[PDB]
Paper text:
The challenge of [name] folding at the ribosome is met by the conserved ribosome-associated complex ([name]), which forms a chaperone triad with the Hsp70 protein Ssb in fungi, and consists of the non-canonical Hsp70 Ssz1 and the J domain protein Zuotin (Zuo1). Here we determine cryo-EM structures of Chaetomium thermophilum [name] bound to 80S ribosomes. [name] adopts two distinct conformations accommodating continuous ribosomal rotation by a flexible lever arm. In both [name] conformations, interactions with the ribosome are exclusively formed through Zuo1 by a lever arm (residues 253–371) that we define based on our structures to include ZHD-αIII (residues 253–289), the entire MD (residues 290–354) and 4HB-αI (residues 355–371) (main panels).
Although a previous study suggested that the [name]-ribosome interaction changes with ribosomal rotation, our data clearly show that the Zuo1 lever arm anchors [name] at the ribosome with two main contacts (C1 and C2) that are maintained in both [name] conformations independent of the ribosomal rotation state. However, the lever arm undergoes a complex motion, which can be described by a bending elbow located in the MD (here denoted as the MD-elbow at Lys305). Although, in [name]-1, the MD-elbow is bent by 37°, it is straightened in [name]-2 (main panels). In [name]-2, these interactions have disappeared, and straightening the MD-elbow moved the lever arm by up to 40 Å on top of protein eL22, which fixes the ZHD hinge by two internal loops and its very C terminus. In particular, Zuo1 Arg296 is involved in π-cation stacking with a tryptophan and in a salt bridge. Finally, adjacent to C1, a weak contact between H47 and a single lysine (Lys268) is observed in [name]-2, which is lost in [name]-1. Although at C2 the contact with ES12 stays invariant in both [name] conformations and throughout ribosomal rotation, the tip of ES12 adapts by a 15° bend in [name]-2, independent of 40S body rotation. The tip of ES12 thus moves by 15 Å. Noteworthy, in [name]-2 the slight detachment of Ssz1-NBD from Zuo1-ZHD (moved away from the tunnel exit by 10 Å compared with [name]-1) already opens this weak contact and provides access to the tunnel exit. First, the DnaJ J domain is superposed on Zuo1-J ([name]-2 chosen, [name]-1 also possible).
Residue numbers in the entry:
A (entry chain C): 3 to 298
B (entry chain D): 9 to 434, 439 to 480, 523 to 566, 571 to 577
The structure:
Amino acid sequence: ATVVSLPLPTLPEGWAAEKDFKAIGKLTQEGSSMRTLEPVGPHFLAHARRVRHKRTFSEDDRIQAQAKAKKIEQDSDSDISEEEDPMLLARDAKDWKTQDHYKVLGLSKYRWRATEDQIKRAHRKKVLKHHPDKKAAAGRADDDNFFKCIQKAAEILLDPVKRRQFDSVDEEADIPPPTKKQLAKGNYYELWGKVFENEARFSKIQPVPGFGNENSTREEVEAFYNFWYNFDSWRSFEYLDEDVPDDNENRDQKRHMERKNANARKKKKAEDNARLRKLVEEAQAGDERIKRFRQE
Amino acid sequence: APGERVVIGITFGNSNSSIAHTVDDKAEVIANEDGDRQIPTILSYVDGDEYYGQQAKNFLVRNPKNTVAYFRDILGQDFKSVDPTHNHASAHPQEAGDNVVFTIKDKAEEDAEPSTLTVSEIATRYLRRLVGAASEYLGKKVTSAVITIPTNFTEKQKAALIAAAAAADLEVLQLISEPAAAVLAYDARPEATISDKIIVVADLGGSRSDVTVLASRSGMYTILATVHDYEYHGIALDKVLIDHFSKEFLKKNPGAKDPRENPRSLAKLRLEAESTKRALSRSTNASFSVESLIDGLDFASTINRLRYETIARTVFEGFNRLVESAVKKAGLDPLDVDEVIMSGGTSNTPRIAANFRYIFPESTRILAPSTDPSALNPSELQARGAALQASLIQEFETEDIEQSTHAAVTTMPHVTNAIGVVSVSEKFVPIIAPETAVPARRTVHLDAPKEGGDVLVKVVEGSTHINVREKVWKIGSTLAEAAVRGVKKGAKVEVTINVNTDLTVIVTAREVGVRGTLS
Ligand SMILES: Nc1ncnc2c1ncn2[C@@H]1O[C@H](COP(=O)(O)OP(=O)(O)OP(=O)(O)O)[C@@H](O)[C@H]1O
Ligand SMILES: [Mg+2]
């Protein structure tokens, strides 16, 4: 019996009931839930004693439906993972850091907007399928080259920081701006809405204004422009850094190379910021909402 | 015969196995002929002689084609599903029918054709040897055992395990999960107190990782969630050291060939890295030396635990991401967990335990050797729990175990929300904890009002809510309202709530009485 140092409410004046008890509610099957226990421990053995007394022979088949009602089992779904491997991605070509790391692992549909769980699942699936020991035995000497491709993708996309770096550098998942006159034949606002959300990933504030249609109010227009004009981004270019020969050990050579790559990184960041500013300017130039607002 | 059974507890993992028995209702782990209580699940053959344990682990250099290891997963698994990654050094399984097989030389004659033993044959031989060593230690012939298994073994794998045991002349009374064995190893101790706790079992092994979330109420446990990761583990921890020391050695010795490409060199580096890892897991400084790595070149260096955790930092956040992934999958909050038991050989690392100490609030108890004085061996938890279960069920008839392990006994509709009473001062107090199992009766003692007299006990439903972080209760639908007449000033009122299988709710509020029924 648990002792609790908390006071009970004083009974209101003029309240009574049969045997000083009033039934208001009850428990429902929605208010409950069926889970299955693990048959372990002396208190379970006592429970099993009681159940054997109540029912004797257990109706496992009858209660299978009850157990199936609210239980979780492993979900095996390789249907999406099957995808397709046309021409075996250059016939198991192997070249570090200069290839496509989403096709090997079937990530074209999701790309950046992916889940670590599916990444792990796909990695396991294609390790089972293209394992050198398991399947190259039937003469597939170059299958290990593919396995190397899965392995390289696994390390590069395994850690959050480096995978984010690779995405930032070369996602290869962007829409070019619709500057073409031929492209500019549909609704202007829809044609521009997609680009802002496509590149909005790098913002500091997760909730991001998203342009809009003709009816968009003046306050929304101002908020959207102010947010995009003052924008902070985490896009980075370290992944493009020059590699170093292993023979080198001189502190001086390492320091020199580090300075060189750092300056190149700063240059790339600056040019990217300028490009984004140019796109925002072109959007403001095209927009006519400001003209309508001045007219009001 | 049931009255003459000799039962033991067995833990059977990918990396190593363990055996245990019960002395005076207390579990004790058995040491084998080599003195090992964590016996590697490795088999090796030399000159037709069968070797196991530490000798088999050492004989990897001696026999390339006669060593078998990492065969636990392959059991009861089809050729397509089996993964030979960890088994790459060991014999390649050859798809015969639906049952892959290892081809090794187990005969004594030097010009004899090597046998093609099945995975079942290998499991049978290994369990036979384990039972035999238990028999020498006990002085009696072991006849029965309870063996621990992960929760994701398929029915076909269970059948393979029982068939292997039958071929090894061992009848398996029951298969239990390693988290359940680990929790029982603590709960069945004399000093243990049964109470409602949220328990996280983190079994961190060599080739695998298991995180399981359980709610333990009334001394009985209900599984809320489970995750199993094959990526982060002791093999990866050994690998970061093999690469680190390969870089150091190569730099120190100019022109040396990288040891990672030579199978003998890489095996020596793994064994020495594992020994150095355990030495730095027991001490703050560890030595690393290998005589004649390649071309007769020796190597000797040192490494501290700080450098080990620095080069191994990434796996620590991988384990963190795993634990929050599991809690989110269980729909819970770190403020909701009461105890986290850290299990497995890797669980002896102090820094991982400290990492969970920083992840979880101080009210949560982290049961790990370096964070609790009363902790048990994480590599012995499962084997001792299995031995305790074997001693508990050694007298039951096989029909009694069969009926006791059916869904008709285990299944029940757990009450979703909480049941409590409203307290006011001039807040929801839970009496029935959430996710109730079978019939539950709980008791609370509350304070009377400032002067007392007539007092209102209003029992309502309750739900947990997180406020930004601190957990509060939110009062929902009202269940019952009772009154106690003339309560003394400062007296305590005893309130009992019973939720019978029939879903009938009995309420009692007697001061130290009023009773009521909710159909
Ligand atoms: N005393 C120890 N100190 C530190 N690490 C250890 C110790 N003993 C074993 N280990 C390491 O911990 C891991 C063993 O953990 P665990 O006991 O959970 O494995 P297992 O039961 O053999 O296998 P499985 O993970 O398949 O259940 C291995 O990586 C091993 O090298
Ligand atoms: Mg284990």
